[PDB]
Amino acid sequence: GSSHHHHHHMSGENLYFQGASAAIVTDTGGVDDKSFNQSAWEGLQAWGKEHNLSKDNGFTYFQSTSEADYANNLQQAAGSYNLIFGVGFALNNAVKDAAKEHTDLNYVLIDDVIKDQKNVASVTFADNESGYLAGVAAAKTTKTKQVGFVGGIESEVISRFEAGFKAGVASVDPSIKVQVDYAGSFGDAAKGKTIAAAQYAAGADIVYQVAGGTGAGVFAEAKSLNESRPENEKVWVIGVDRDQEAEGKYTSKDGKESNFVLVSTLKQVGTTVKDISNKAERGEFPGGQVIVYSLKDKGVDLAVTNLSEEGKKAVEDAKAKILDGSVKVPEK
Ligand SMILES: Nc1ncnc2c1ncn2[C@@H]1O[C@H](CO)[C@@H](O)[C@H]1O
Ligand code: NI
Ligand code: NI
Numbered sequence: 001g002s003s004h005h006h007h008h009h010m011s012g013e014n015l016y017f018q019g020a021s022a023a024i025v026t027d028t029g030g031v032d033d034k035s036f037n038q039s040a041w042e043g044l045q046a047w048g049k050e051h052n053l054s055k056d057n058g059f060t061y062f063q064s065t066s067e068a069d070y071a072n073n074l075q076q077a078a079g080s081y082n083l084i085f086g087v088g089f090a091l092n093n094a095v096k097d098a099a100k101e102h103t104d105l106n107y108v109l110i111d112d113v114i115k116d117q118k119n120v121a122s123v124t125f126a127d128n129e130s131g132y133l134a135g136v137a138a139a140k141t142t143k144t145k146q147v148g149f150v151g152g153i154e155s156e157v158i159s160r161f162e163a164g165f166k167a168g169v170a171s172v173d174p175s176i177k178v179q180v181d182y183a184g185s186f187g188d189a190a191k192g193k194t195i196a197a198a199q200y201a202a203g204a205d206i207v208y209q210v211a212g213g214t215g216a217g218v219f220a221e222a223k224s225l226n227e228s229r230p231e232n233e234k235v236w237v238i239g240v241d242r243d244q245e246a247e248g249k250y251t252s253k254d255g256k257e258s259n260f261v262l263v264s265t266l267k268q269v270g271t272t273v274k275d276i277s278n279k280a281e282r283g284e285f286p287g288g289q290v291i292v293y294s295l296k297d298k299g300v301d302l303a304v305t306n307l308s309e310e311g312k313k314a315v316e317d318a319k320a321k322i323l324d325g326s327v328k329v330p331e332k
Contacts, residue, residue: 025091028187030187033187034244037212038242085107130301131162135172147208164330204235243305245306
């Protein structure tokens with residue numbers, strides 16, 4: 001206001017900001033998946049730090065034992081939390097039902113859309129765009145002209161990554177074969193190891209793992225092979241969701257210390273959890289809206305860790321073309 005004029009002096013002790021309590025309900029994969037759920041949890045604990053809270057005293061996570069536990073975890077969360085995040089497309093139905101029972105609480109679904117509910121916000125990522133960049137990187141590195149893709153669960157969500165990745169490989173050299181296999185789970189490391197073993201054995205020298213915690217198996221396999229080979233004969237893993245450079249550390253047969261993580265796609269789930277938690281606490285929750293994070297707003301990106309300069313150039317060129325609209329990346 002230009003002028004106020006009628007005013008009273010208020011003491012700082014008598015202004016107060018009402019806090020929110022925010023919880024994430026995570027899928028089979030856990031808060032220690034080194035990727036999707038860990039990004040969400042790192043974001044919530046950053047938000048907790050900023051608001052002077054601790055685990056189970058203003059923020060927490062509920063690990064879901066199975067699909068049946070989604071509803072039970074959301075109901076438990078409604079006991080003490082007024083902003084509740086369902087982390088993963090699979091929580092769609094359970095979040096819709098919980099939001100109808102508790103119209104006074106706010107709900108966020110990550111990686112899928114719920115429509116026509118004033119107390120639900122939906123968050124999606126253009127993982128096709130980051131996958132494309134990963135494809136360009138892979139195409140510019142593969143010596144065997146074969147690369148692997150290990151998906152978690154067949155879905156709109158993982159199909160975005162797969163379509164982007166194939167389009168990205170094809171944009172550089174369509175002669176490169178892309179072996180695709182799904183694990184049927186985001187929390188099955190042993191299946192990730194088996195699938196990686198076969199993709200590498202069949203002559204893939206790079207595997208992109210888009211399977212959350214299942215990906216720990218892909219890392220374990222690549223490490224095993226690379227530990228029993230010369231440095232210059234190593235096989236690569238592409239990281240997902242977080243920068244997974246740290247998981248790529250090994251000692252070759254040769255005795256050289258090295259890293260088998262080529263690049264990582266980034267998905268800023270943690271940043272989204274923190275920003276929406278702050279909006280919820282300020283009484284500006286984006287209920288009923290669909291928030292789309294893409295390459296332009298850096299909600300997805302590629303970390304170019306151990307890529308060659310030729311690869312880094314091809315990634316920067318592809319990135320610019322996606323941002324300007326010259327390349328439209330397929331979603332299926
Ligand atoms: N536990 C999970 N539940 C649902 N989707 C998941 C889970 N872990 C990973 N994903 C999906 O797989 C992608 C690659 O890890 C993530 O960006 C996310 O879309
Ligand atoms: Ni004023
Ligand atoms: Ni007055």
